[PDB]
Every structure is written in C-alpha cells, then in structure tokens.
C-alpha cells in the first residue's frame, strides 16, 4: 500500500455558475510517494518537466492517475513536473484550472453561505494499492474583502476517508474501498451591492406604493396604482436581467411578489371603499385612511416571513 | 461474437438546451469482455492507464470503439483505464462528459415531462462480431429535490436491441444488425419558480385588468386600459427575457395572449357601451356592469383551454 | 482516375447562425474506392479504427483527404474507421459535426425558405486523379414537425460536377477541374411561435392604436398617443431582444415601422383637426371621425406591401 | 535568399468584434519556393497530406513557419498539403480560420468605412534568408450585397515591404529586416437595417417630442414631457441592447443625447413661459408658440453637427 | 546559476473581465541563456521551429519551463522557436495569448486607474539553479487614444525579485527563493462614452426631477412623481444591462441611489406640505417653493460625496 502525501495550493476561486452549481479553481497539486532508490546524475534530485514525463512512464515509471471526482469536464493542465530523488521518493507538481461541482443552496440570496469542495481519489488504485498518507491545504488568501465577490471564512476543512463501491471490477474480496481526499472551504457572499442597489430602492418602491391612499379622489387613487403596478414589473425585469438564474425563488424574488400583492390588495380595497356604501359614494372614512393600517401590516407579514 | 457487459454510472444531468434539444451528462463507462488468457506480472490483474493504452493497441490489443449514437460533438474524455486479467477478461473504464440529443417536447412548460436517453453502439463491429451481453445503469442520485431544477423519477429504463442498416457496404450476407443499448431516464421539471414568479403575478395582472369596469367615467375606463395594455407588454418582455427560447408557444405564452385578448375585448366593449346608444351617452347599465360577466367568462375560456 | 463512391448520413441539422449564415450538421461520411488486392488475416475484411489509421498511412496506404468546401472552421471528428477488403476495395467511415456556410436570405422572416448545402471536394487530387463515381444521401428524418424549429421538405438534392480553377500551379494541360459533390436540403421555418407570440399581439397593438379617435377631448386624444408611442417602443425592444440579429429589415420589422407611422400620422391629424378651423375649436366633425378611414387605409397599405 | 511566392484565397469575412477590433477570415494559403531537385515516384509531383508532413520535416525537409502577425490567438488549421515537384519546387497549401486584429474606427456608425488587414511574415527567417517574391490575392466574392452585412468595395490592396526590428539578439550586422506581406480589403457597412429600424423611428420620436407645445394647459404641457422623457430612456435601452458595444459615442448615440436635450430644453421653456410673467399666468403668447422656433432650431443644430 | 535574459513584446491588451479581475494579453517572449558551445551546420546559428523542439529536448537539450504565475488557465501558444548558436547561447522565442489575473479596483468607475501585471517565474528551477539576469519590455503602442477603450500611460514598470516559499521539499539549505519577474503597465479608462451617454442624461433626469415643485396642484405634484420614480427604474435597468457586473457599487450606482432618494424625499415633502396645516389645505407657501432649496441642497450633498 503506497503511502501518498498530497499538498493543494489554492490560488483563486471564481466564476460561480449558479444554475450548474459549478465554480472555477486555479492552483497546484503536489503528490509525494517513495519508490525504489534511483541513480540520479551527480546525486542531486532529477527534474523532469512536461513532455519528458511521458517518456519516463513509457520506460516503466509508475505515475498513478489521480482523478478529481467532482470535476466538470477535464481540467486545463498547465505545467507538469516530476522531481526524482535518488533515495527513491518522487514528487509530482502540476498547475490546474478546473470547473468543480457541488450541492449549492441559493435560497437565501444574496445572503448565501456556500462551501467549495474538492474531491481527490486515485482513478484505478484501491486503498490496498494506494493510500493517502496525509494532506495539507494552503489557502494563501487574505485582505481586500470588500473588493472580492466572496469572503473566505475558515482556513480549509480536510477529510481523508475510504469510499466503498458496491458494484465494481471482477473483484469481490476487499479491493473496493478507494481512499478519497475531501477539501472543504467555507465562504460568504458580499451582500453590499445587492443591498444598496436592489433591496434599498425596492423598499422605497413598496413604501411609496402605500402613498396611494393619501390621494383625495377615487379616480386618482385607482389610476395611479396601475402606474405603480407597471413600476414593479419594470423592477422585476431590472432585477431578473442582472441577478443569477435559479430554479427557485430567492428573498428578493419574494419581495417582488410582496410588491405585487401590496398593490393588488390596495386595488381591491380602493374599489371596495368606493362601492361598499350606504348611498354610492360613502368611502369609509377609516378604510380610506388605512394609510397606516397595512404599511405596518406589511411589516408584520414581512417579519412573519422571517419565521 | 464477443459478449460485452456494459455498466454506466451517471453522476450528473444538467444544462438542458431547449432549442437544440440537448443535455449534458457526466459519468463513467465500464465495458467488459473476455479475451485470450494473458501472462500478467506476478498474476494480479494489470492496470494500464491513459497514455499507455495506445501503446498496447499498437502491439495488437483489440479495443473496440464504442460510439455514443446520440452525442452532439465529441465527449470530453477524462481518465481512461484498462484492467487486464490473466484469465483473459478485459475491463475498460473511462469518465465522460457529453452533450446528448433527444426529441424534447416543451409545449406544456413549465410542467414538462422529459426523458433523457443514451444510445450506445459499436462503431464498426456488427452483432455477429460484437454483441452486448448485458447492461446495468447506476443512477446514484437521491434527495434534495427542491434544490435541483429537475426531479428524477424512476430508476433507469434499459433496452438492448438490434439495429438494422439497409444501406451499407458492398457486403451482402447478414452483417447489418449492430447491437444497440438504449438507456432512458424519466424526469420532471421543478415548476415552483415559474409558478410563484411568473404564473401568480400574471394572474394578478389579468385579474386587475378586469377592474377597469369599476371606473365611473368613460374616459377613465378607456385611457386606463392603455396603461394596462402597456403593462402586459412589459410582462411579456420580462417573461421572454428569462424563459427558454422555443419555436412554439408554451402555456405561459398562451396566458400572455389571453391577457392581450382580455384587454382588447374590454377596449371594444368600453367603446361599444359608450356609442351603442339611443341618445349619445346611453352607457348600457348592464354592459358597463359586466364587471362579473367576463372575469368568469375568462375562467370558462381558461377551463376550455384545458380540454 | 480513381472512382470514389460516397455516402452521406445526416443525423441532425441545428443551430442556424443568421448573421454568419451558418448551420451545424451531425452525420457520417462513407467513402469507397478500389485499390490493389490485399492479404487480410484469414480472408475476411480487415477493420482499422482511429489511431491505427495513421499507422497504415505511414506504411504507404493511400487515404486521400476530402475537404468540406463550405465548412467554417474544422469539423469535430468523432470515430474514424477503415474497412480493408482483400479484393482491394477500401471503405472509410467517420462521424462528423461541422459548421457550414451558405447564402441565406432572411428577408421574409419568419416565413423563410432555406436550403442547407454541403460541398465535398478532394483537397489535392484532380478529376484525372480522383473522380466521384456516385453519391447517395440518407436523411433518416421524419415525423414531429411541430416539435422541431425547421421542417425538412424534400429528400435531398444531389449534384456531382466539375469545378475549374483558373489560377493554380504552373501546370497547363488540364489538371484543373477537381470534381465536386453538392448536396442540397430544402427546409421551411416553423412560423407558429412568431405568429402567435409576435404577429398577433403586434396586430392588436396597431388595431388598438386606432381607438384613439373614439376619445372625446383633444387633450385626451393627444396625450394618450404618447403612451401609445411608448408602447410600440417597448414592443420593438421585446421583439429585437428575442428575434435573430440581421443586417436587414424583416416583415416583422416593417410591421413595427408601420406602427410608428400609424401613431405619428394620428398625431399629425389630431393636431391638424384642432387647429385647422374657422374659429379655434372647429374640430372637423368628419376628420375626427376618421375612426374608420385609415384603419382600412392601413389595410390598403398593408395589402400594398404584399405587392 | 529564398524566393517565396504566396497566394491567398479569401472565402468568407465575418464575425466582427467591435470592442476587440477583431474579425474572422476563412481561406487558404499557398506558398511556393524552389528547393533542390528530388526523385519522386514515377516523375509526377509527390503529394504529402496532413500527418505525413511532420514525418518529412523530421527527415530534414525545410518547411519555414509563416506567422500571421495580426492574428489573435492561433488559427484553426484545416487540411494541410505539401506538393513536391521533382524539379525541386515545393508548394504548401493549407486552409485556415483565424481571428485578426486591426485598428477599427466606429465613430460614424452605422456609416463606417473599414479595412480588413492581413499581415504575413516569416517567423524566424530574415530577408536575407527568406524573401517574398510576389503575392496575389483572390477575393472570389460578388453579388447579393443586400444580403450580407458588409459590402466589399475594392479588389484587395497588396504591399510587400521590409520591417526592421531594432532590438533583437546581440546581433549587429543586417539580419533584422524581415519581409512582410500586407493585404488590405476595403469594406462598407450595410446601413439599411439601422436606418429603417433605428434612425427613422428615433426621428419620429424627436419630432413628436416637439408636439408638446400644441397642448393648451400648462399642466398638460409639463406632465406629458415626463412620459416623453421616459420614452427616450426606453429607446436608449432598446438601442443599447441591440447595437454593438463601444468605448465611444456613435452618431446614433449623439441623436439620443439630442433627444434628451430637446425634451429638457422644452421643460425649461415650459416652466419659464408660465412663471416669466407680469401677473402670474402670463404665458408668453409667442414663446408658447415656439412650436416652430426650435424644431427648425434643432435642424440648424443638427446640420451644425455635420460640420 | 544560469543567467537568463528575458524580453517581452506586448502587442495588444484587451478583454477585461471585471468580475474575474482578468485581462487578455497578446505578445512574444524571448528568453536567452548561454549553454555549452555547439557544432552547428556551417557555423551560422541553427533554427529549430515548433514540432522539432520536442525532438531536441528528448536528445537532452535543457529547455526550462517558465511559468506565468498570474495566468488564468493555460495560454494559447502560437509559433515556437529555438535559435541555437555555436558559441553556446540559446534563444527561445514564442508568441502567446493569455488571460491574466490581478487585483482590480473598480469603485470609481468609469474613472478607474488600473495596472496590468505579468509575473514570470521558473517552474522548477530555484535562484541557485536559474537566475533572471535582466529584462526589457517593449510596449510598441502609441496614438489613437480616443479609439481604444484604455489609455496606456507609462512605458512598463519592471521588477526582478526573489520569492521565498516557506513550505517545500525536504530540502533545507537555501533552495527556496525562486527568482520572479514582475511587469507593471499603468492604464486609464476612456471615460468619454460613460460621461456623455450615462452621466449627462442621468443628470438631466435628476435635475428634471426637481421640476415637480413648479406644479400647481397637489394631485399633480404627487402623481407625476410616480412616473418620475418609474423613470429612474427604467434608467437603472438601462445602466445595469450595459455596464460591467461588479460586486460593489460604482459612482454611477451611487448617482442612481441619489435619484431614488431625491424623488422619495420629494414625495415625503409633498405629502407633508399638504397635511401639515392649520386648516387642511395650508400648503406651506415656502416649503412648496423649495424649488431651489434642495436642488442646491443636492449639490451640497453631491459635493459632500466627493469628500
């Protein structure tokens, strides 16, 4: 069972595809194991870069393929390196850029909490053939949180485990528990942009929506609400065009629906006030002055949405 | 006739292209057959990964090309593997990411029922040369339905069959029925987002459209319907910009048309009421009070559209 | 002069780029010719798949490059196959996906009639070296026309011809008429989506535009037309964002212009009616009642646009 | 100094990226030179296609790399060909698709005059090693100008010249003037679509904007201009979403700004008319009748913009 | 310690991805070092182009891999060249197109000051093995600033330094300070387009917003501001669709918020004026005439935003 020591260096995490639940990672992989002692020129470690690596493999050098389990497609591999020590030990170093998959919940956008995961596992060698001795992850990030879209919180969670496959090759005894490395990085979304440019004015719209009751005439009260309705549509559009596409409603989406509801509820009351009468024009002096009733009734329903 | 046992592992199904009728699948293929007994180092099965596979083929190893019949373009192949057993048997394992084609009906969006199909067939070897002994599909999915766009329903329907080609080479005996594997996975669209963010407010618009009849004056009744018309246009825009592009109308599309019709019908009636008179301003006391006539007349036409 | 028999199998025609006048084709090519008799293992035809083909060419196997004349870029090639018969004959089979170029007229969108063309020609061998004996095309399509964007009409038109190049090497006798295969597939656009979701409501807008004359007051008549103008703009936007980009106007585009014209003409008349007077407020009783004059005058100009 | 004769065949020029100042070219390159006499099978010219070319270079065939100086990225190379004559001369023929860079001025859009440039230069061989003897360019285009986005005017300008590099190796004598071929193709944009679908209705908007002065009341005059302002915004959006992205304003963009100005100027005058008084409601009978003053004053400013 | 002389030629800097903090660079790299004297054919320098380079490396030619530290993905490499002199020295020349990463602050858009950085470092060889002797950068740009999106200011800033890695191999003496080249190019955004097409009309909107106070009636004053609110939403949409996506607010974004505030503040005062009375309709003769109070009060808050 070959003991493999792994090191991951994370340079950049970007390009989150919400719909695909995907994110891009740039960094380096270092994998170390001890083979049989070699004779290197001089005695210093031998360096074998890109193209030459294949040439060594052909001559019988064992270099196990390490698969990224949760990679979408196949990574852009930059430079490759083999460091061959005379004492036997071998070090493989390579830069990579890949698209990774993970379960991502965006319900509470733009206040998401996400975690970026990497799953490493030998493509063909089982736990008895190849085993992950240890792993360290270096997230050389820091500073300038207000400049980046995501705020990295922890350092990097790590877990070496053994994954069992129940249906595999023509083997039944115990060659079935490939060892898997799982790296987890917690992150929080920078909610500044969405708060100031989306939440805030949307609030002002909903608030100004209620100002329709301060109008004197019934015709004024009613006709103005159609423009108000059309305003919310225009905002929904502005929101939808810029925000990330999802298969579910976010907090903002709910706020939008709330806006439609408030205006429609106002429409109903306005018509009601006018025609619920004991003459014809008996506009209920109190109901027309619900200028304070449902604005705070909206704040009650809004606080109920938090529950 | 070589007996080939196949195994497909499906990891992820995403990125449906409605216009192209296309979807992306990430997973692994396992193919097994029995060749002539080999002499492996020691006696344990020999593993041959990526690059080295070509080398073995060059020395005469028979590795038949299995084409994905319904693939669009050519799949991103990740790691490849050959497992060579001394008793003869050979196992080929490879990860893939592909775009696949299938007939997709989107007429009843967002309540579509779709099925994701995979078609496997030997590229060059006919049924008498190469035959598919059996196939098992593993869809290791489950849980979190309300997080994913699509809800997988069944487990995986499978069909091994023999496909006859009527026009081939200048060969005449019976070498024309290549064996094909067909995998089918049924799926249902998560309609939640479209119901709450599209259907619901659209309904409110159509409903509030009818509130034009509660207006007193004729000028009021008429002018307001122009803003109402403009509102439906703004919504059609908002709808179209976000919804998938299709060469046919969906349920939502029909709802939009219905909205245009309701308003246009109201325009006609409003003008009619005013000018269908026995004086000039004889606005038919009952026709102006069709505030209940066609809202339910719309619910009759709406229920007729279900038939 | 080598006689080459060709067979093209078309699987899918999709992804029309209007601006580039491009379309994507997936299918197979089969090329057959007779070489010098070989000695195959056993006596049955020898199969040579992908990688091994290059190896045979290196040893002197003549495999002539067939260029797609009207291909944009270079096709994604899938699996390749050589079938080598002992009697000499050779069959090359390959799957392809390419972007192809052709003159495409979109003036009468969404009622275009298009034809998809394929042009095959030997890259380096002239008519006296290599000649196309025959060609058959199999468009295995059928059914579900209302599901697909395009409706294939005929079977496939075919033409083998000889193309003369006037400027090549310093060669004079007659090595200049490369033989070219030209496949033509006629198709019609599925106009349903555009009729119901674009043409229909656009018509309703234009028709409702004329309802401005049923307004009593001059201020009502004029102010309302500004909303009406703004409505057409919103529609032009909705249209333009969804419809394909073109360097020329379509039928729909012309409809839009007609919309602007109707409203602008109305604006002119409205102002004219009011100020062409014998006092100040002499709104010409008949010109204000042009509520029927130019709606059918628009139907006369619309029918003139067909001529 | 090897004399190289070059021939470029241009098939298609498309996909202009305005922001990148890029355009796509599909075509063929023919390069000819005379080497030392060979012994070809028989005596006829020997053809060496794609893969086999590398094999010949490895055996010492000199095939100089010709770099496309203004190519963005590296060209999609289709088929390659070497024609080897027994008298010594060599012809290299290859199809290419590339993204090319050139200074592009889009100030006067949609009336741009552009020129598509190609720059060919030997990658490593200087004028004393390799020299471009002659070059002919074939632009096999013609007809259907109203169908294509761009109208090619000339026949293609050519220039062979010598480019001196001042900073190279520690080399001082005269190996520093690589020979460069420069091809120029002049072209004009098809302005039809932008004239009818953008310029024309934008004109109508600006013209109708001035109709605000024919309104009787001050409140009518003022309130209507806010819808008018909103109309220009909607148009700017419609324009911006469809037109190419640029880092500078075009003619159309200026027209938009003119629209904003006209309305804002009207706003100022309207308010001024009302409040510049000798009583309070003394609306200057002449200034309110600037229904003709600044429409033609706009046509004076518009004709000044041409200067 | 091998002395390496580097030369970078920058042809084009384009395609800035604001979200990814990425930019594209086209150019050439020249690397020079002196090896052991060779015997070249004749005596002149030997040129080895693309494919042939690998062949030389296989035979023991040392060609050290130089990694682009801040590259996203892996560069499109064009033509490669080796120049081998007999005196020993070796010159490697290659064209590249890459996506590079750097900290980019876009807060003060469209008046950003950015700097494009390139970081070069040997992939495997430390400062004692390989050392950067010198570097010169040639930015052959100039002229036509008003045609390009970015205006290059300086000539490039250059810095050779030694980067120490703290966690490496089981090596302890001092093999840890790889030598790194850092190139910096300062640039300024061309603000013309955003000033004239965004800032200017946005200003006119805000200015015209304040014209609501010149309206006589309270109903006019209030109802008009709902259109005015809707106008700002339409503008935000227009802005957001065309401007670059960021995770923070820009100057323009702030201007938009200011617009929402101005209108909402106006709404509050308008309602206040009307209902803050000593009777019912005592609209405060001075507060209604704050037609000049807060327009300059906004110019005070606007000037305070600069502090």
Q: Which of C124, C219, C261 sits opposite D81 (nearest CB)?
A: C124
Q: Which of D76, D148, D228 sits opposite C74 (nearest CB)?
A: D76
Alpha-carbon separation of residue E269 from A202, C155, D187, E265, E273 (angstroms): 20, 74, 59, 6, 6
Residue labelled with tokens 């909303």: C227
What distance in Å separates the CA atoms of residue A164 and residue E50, rounded to the nearest whole number? 46
Other beta carbons within 10 angstroms of residue B267's beta carbon come to 22
Q: Tell if the CB–CB gap between C219 and D214 is shorter than 8 Å.
A: no
In the DSSP assignment, the letter for residue D290 is: T
Choose, out of B11, B30, B49, B266, the residue to mutate when testing the contact with A (most A CBs < 10 Å): B49
Q: Which of A12, A93, A190 sits opposite E247 (nearest CB)?
A: A190
Residue labelled with tokens 């005592």: E282
Same domain, yes or no: E164 and E206: no
Tokens of B205: 């618009």
What distance in Å separates the CA atoms of residue E55 and residue B139, rounded to the nearest whole number? 46
Nearest residue of C to residue B124, measured between CA atoms: C81
Q: Which of B72, B124, B169 sits opposite C26 (nearest CB)?
A: B72
Question: What does this entry list as its resolution, in Å?
Answer: 3.6
Torsion, Cα of D165, D168, D171, D176 (10° steps): -20
* CA-based nearest distance E98→chain D, Å: 9
Residues whose CB falls within 8 Å of the CB of residue C303, separated by 6 or more in sequence, listed in order? none
Q: Which of C130, C165, C190 marks a domain boundary?
A: C190
Contacting residues of A for E257, CB less than 8 Å apart:
196-197, 200-201
Residues whose CB falls within 8 Å of the CB of residue B23, separated by 6 or more in sequence, listed in order? B13, B14, B15, B16, B17, B99, B100, B102, B116
Nearest residue of C to residue B107, measured between CA atoms: C147
CA neighbor of A88 nearest in space, from A49, A45, A135, A56: A45
Nearest residue of B to residue A70, measured between CA atoms: B11
Q: Tell if the CB–CB gap between A245 and B242 is shorter than 8 Å.
A: yes
Same domain, yes or no: A51 and A183: yes
Q: Tell if the CB–CB gap between D149 and C64 is shorter than 8 Å.
A: no
Same domain, yes or no: C43 and C147: yes
Residue C288 belongs to domain with CATH number: 1.20.58.390
* CA-based nearest distance B106→chain C, Å: 8
Contacting residues of D for E215, CB less than 8 Å apart:
219, 222-223
Alpha-carbon separation of residue D170 from D42, D167, D179, E41 (angstroms): 48, 8, 20, 20
Same domain, yes or no: C231 and C254: yes
Q: Are E183 and E158 spatial neighbours (Cβ–Cβ below 8 Å)? A: yes
Alpha-carbon separation of residue C104 from C19, C113, C150, D188, E1 (angstroms): 9, 9, 14, 20, 63
Q: Are D190 and D173 spatial neighbours (Cβ–Cβ below 8 Å)? A: no
Residues whose CB falls within 8 Å of the CB of residue D229, separated by 6 or more in sequence, listed in order? D260, D263, D264, D267, E205, E208, E231
In the DSSP assignment, the letter for residue C62 is: -
Tokens of D206: 């600006």
* CA-based nearest distance D69→chain C, Å: 20
Q: Which of B153, B174, B190 marks a domain boundary?
A: B190
Choose, out of A201, A225, A239, A243, the residue to mutate when testing the contact with E (most E CBs < 10 Å): A201
Number of domains comprising chain C:
2
What distance in Å separates the CA atoms of residue B242 and residue A154, rounded to the nearest whole number? 36
Tokens of E152: 């290059």
Q: Which of B65, B167, B237 sits opposite C138 (nearest CB)?
A: B167
Q: Tell if the CB–CB gap between B236 and C238 is shorter than 8 Å.
A: yes
Q: Which of B227, B233, B240 sits opposite C242 (nearest CB)?
A: B240
Q: Tell if the CB–CB gap between E233 and A205 is shorter than 8 Å.
A: yes
Same domain, yes or no: A120 and A216: no
Tokens of D77: 């190379």
What distance in Å separates the CA atoms of residue E73 and residue B190, rounded to the nearest whole number? 35
- The SS3 call for residue B289 is coil
* CA-based nearest distance A174→chain E, Å: 34
State the residue range of the domain holding D115.
1-190
Torsion, Cα of D37, D42, D43, D47 (10° steps): -80
Q: Tell if the CB–CB gap between B224 and A229 is shorter than 8 Å.
A: no
Query: Could you give phi then psi for residue B204, rounded to 5 degrees?
Result: -60, -40
What distance in Å separates the CA atoms of residue D273 and residue C144, rounded to the nearest whole number? 67
Choose, out of D98, D102, D112, D124, the residue to mutate when testing the contact with E (most E CBs < 10 Å): D124
Same domain, yes or no: E36 and E75: yes
What distance in Å separates the CA atoms of residue C174 and residue C128, rounded to the nearest whole number? 9
Nearest residue of A to residue E61, measured between CA atoms: A52
Chains B and D touch (3+ CB pairs under 8 A): no
Q: Tell if the CB–CB gap between B146 and A72 is shorter than 8 Å.
A: no
* CA-based nearest distance B237→chain C, Å: 5
Q: At what angle do helices B50-58 and C50-58 cross, to 10 degrees?
A: 50
Q: Tell if the CB–CB gap between B267 and C211 is shorter than 8 Å.
A: yes
Residue D140, classified by CB atoms within 10 Å of its CB into exposed (0-12), middle (13-18) or buried (19+), is exposed
Same domain, yes or no: E244 and E285: yes
Residue A153, classified by CB atoms within 10 Å of its CB into exposed (0-12), middle (13-18) or buried (19+), is exposed
Residue C63 belongs to domain with CATH number: 2.70.170.10
Q: Which of E190, E222, E238 marks a domain boundary?
A: E190
Residue-by-residue DSSP string for B89-112: EEEEEEEEEEEEE-----TTTTS-
Contacting residues of C for B264, CB less than 8 Å apart:
204, 207-208
Half-sphere exposure of E174 (CA within 13 A, CB side): 5
Nearest residue of B to residue A259, measured between CA atoms: B201
Q: At what angle do helices C251-275 and C293-304 cross, to 10 degrees?
A: 150
Contacting residues of B for C47, CB less than 8 Å apart:
124-125
Residues whose CB falls within 8 Å of the CB of residue D64, separated by 6 or more in sequence, listed in order? D2, D4, D122, D123, D124, D125, D130, E49
Tokens of D267: 């706003």
Expressed in percent and rounded to 5, the helix, strand and coil fractions of chain C are 30, 30, 35
Same domain, yes or no: E90 and E158: yes
Same domain, yes or no: C152 and C285: no
Q: Tell if the CB–CB gap between A97 and E73 is shorter than 8 Å.
A: yes
Torsion, Cα of E166, E169, E173, E178 (10° steps): -60
Choose, out of E104, E226, E256, the residue to mutate when testing the contact with A (most A CBs < 10 Å): E226
Q: Tell if the CB–CB gap between C55 and B58 is shorter than 8 Å.
A: yes
Same domain, yes or no: D179 and D40: yes
Tokens of D16: 């202009």
What distance in Å separates the CA atoms of residue A246 and residue A227, rounded to the nearest whole number? 28
Peptide bond into E205 cis (omega under 30): no
Same domain, yes or no: C156 and C50: yes
Contacting residues of D for E238, CB less than 8 Å apart:
233, 236-237, 240
Residue labelled with tokens 């093995």: E129
Q: Are C307 and C231 spatial neighbours (Cβ–Cβ below 8 Å)? A: no
Q: Tell if the CB–CB gap between D222 and E207 is shorter than 8 Å.
A: no
Alpha-carbon Rg for chain E in angstroms? 31
* CA-based nearest distance C147→chain B, Å: 6
Contacting residues of B for A21, CB less than 8 Å apart:
14
Contacting residues of A for E240, CB less than 8 Å apart:
238, 241-242
Same domain, yes or no: D153 and D8: yes
Strand order in the sheet with C22-34: C46-49, C76-84, C89-101, C22-34, C2-17, C130-139
Other beta carbons within 10 angstroms of residue D91's beta carbon come to 20
Nearest residue of D to residue E218, measured between CA atoms: D219
Nearest residue of C to residue B104, measured between CA atoms: C147
Query: Could you give phi then psi for residue E92, rounded to 5 degrees?
Result: -100, 120
What distance in Å separates the CA atoms of residue D264 and residue E211, rounded to the nearest whole number? 11
What distance in Å separates the CA atoms of residue C291 and residue C250, rounded to the nearest whole number? 29
Strands, E, within A102-224: which ranges?
A: 113-122, 130-139, 150-152, 157-162, 179-189
- The SS3 call for residue D49 is strand
Alpha-carbon separation of residue A257 from A20, A110, A239, A264, E122 (angstroms): 25, 17, 12, 10, 56
Nearest residue of D to residue C21, measured between CA atoms: D148
Chains E and C touch (3+ CB pairs under 8 A): no
Exposed e or buried b per residue across E58-73, where buried means at least 16 C-beta atoms within 10 angstroms of its C-beta: eeebebbbbbbbbbbb
Q: Tell if the CB–CB gap between C72 and D235 is shorter than 8 Å.
A: no
The neighbouring-strand residues paired with C161 are C180
What distance in Å separates the CA atoms of residue A276 and residue D183, rounded to the nearest whole number? 82
Inter-chain contacts counted by CB atoms under 8 A, chains A and B? 133
What distance in Å separates the CA atoms of residue A266 and residue A271, rounded to the nearest whole number? 9
How were these coordinates obtained? X-ray
Q: Which chains, if any, share at least 3 CB pairs under 8 A with chain D?
A: C, E
What distance in Å separates the CA atoms of residue C293 and residue D9, rounded to the nearest whole number? 59
Q: Are C23 and C16 spatial neighbours (Cβ–Cβ below 8 Å)? A: yes
- The SS3 call for residue B271 is helix
């Amino acid at each position: 069972p070959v003991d493999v020591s792994v090191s991951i260096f994370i340079n950049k995490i970007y390009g989150v595809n919400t719909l695909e639940q995907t994110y891009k990672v740039d960094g380096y992989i270092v994998a170390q194991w001890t083979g049989k002692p070699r004779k290197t020129p001089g005695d210093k470690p031998l360096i074998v870069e890109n193209t030459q690596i294949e040439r060594w493999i052909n001559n019988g050098l064992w270099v196990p393929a390490l698969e990224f389990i949760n990679v979408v497609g196949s990574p852009d591999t930059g430079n490759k390196r083999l460091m061959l020590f005379p004492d036997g030990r071998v070090i493989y170093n390579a830069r990579f850029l890949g698209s990774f998959s993970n379960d991502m919940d965006f319900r509470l956008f733009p206040f998401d909490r996400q975690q970026f995961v990497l799953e490493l596992e030998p493509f063909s060698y089982n736990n008895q053939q190849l085993r992950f001795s240890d792993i360290q992850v270096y997230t050389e990030n820091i500073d300038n949180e207000e400049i980046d879209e995501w705020w990295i919180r922890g350092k990097a969670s790590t877990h070496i485990s053994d994954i069992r496959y129940d249906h595999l090759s023509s083997v039944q005894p115990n060659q079935n528990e490939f060892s898997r490395i799982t790296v987890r990085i917690d992150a929080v979304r920078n909610p500044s942009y969405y708060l100031w440019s989306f939440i805030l004015p949307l609030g002002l719209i909903i608030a100004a929506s209620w100002s329709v009751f301060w109008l004197e005439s019934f015709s004024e009260r009613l006709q103005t609400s159609f423009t108000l309705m059309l305003t919310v549509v225009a905002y929904a559009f502005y929101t939808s065009n810029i925000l990330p596409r999802l298969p579910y409603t976010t907090v903002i989406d709910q706020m939008i629906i709330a806006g439609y509801g408030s205006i429609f509820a106002a429409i109903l009351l306005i018509i009601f006030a006018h025609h619920r009468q004991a003459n014809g024009v008996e506009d209920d002096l109190l109901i027309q002055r619900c200028r304070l009733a449902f604005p705070l009734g909206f704040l009650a329903i809004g606080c109920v949405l938090v529950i």
